[PDB]
Design a binder for this molecule. Structure first.
Ligand SMILES: [Mg+2]
Ligand SMILES: [Mg+2]
Ligand SMILES: [Mg+2]
Ligand SMILES: [Mg+2]
Lengths: 77, 77
């Protein structure tokens, strides 16, 4: 069917590179999905120095930073 | 879910103090995960003058040498 690769990255705490529709890039460990204070759906990404709540509606791509069988680069919407 | 702190240390190239089950201590920068020539899973630790392939099965503890929001210490076994 249809795999939720965001959910799967969080389930396995995968290291990922996230690119936003703005073009900004973030690197870190996929921690969890949650809503931010604005009630927008987010992925919690634990980066080197801080954790970001990044809106899933604003994701352009998610890239694996490790070898695993699930994905290399996922391009969204 | 459970985090791979060896993977995360290498992802962010964290400075770490590694204590082996022998009691030997190594300091350096976490570089990469790879198998050694004996096919054992290792962390490549870049020391001051050389890089060591240290078996992950032989790790006792990994201590942070920098303040960061991932760990101060990880104990194995
Ligand atoms: Mg939205
Ligand atoms: Mg750094
Ligand atoms: Mg010296
Ligand atoms: Mg072994």
């Amino acid at each position: 069917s249809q795999y939720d690769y965001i959910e799967l990255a969080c389930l396995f705490h995968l290291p990922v590179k996230l690119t936003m529709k703005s073009g900004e890039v973030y690197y870190g460990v996929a921690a969890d999905t949650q809503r931010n204070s604005q009630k927008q759906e987010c992925i919690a990404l634990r980066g080197e120095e801080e954790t970001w709540l990044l809106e899933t509606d604003q994701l352009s791509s998610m890239e694996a930073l490790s070898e695993q069988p699930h994905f290399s680069v996922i391009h969204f919407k």
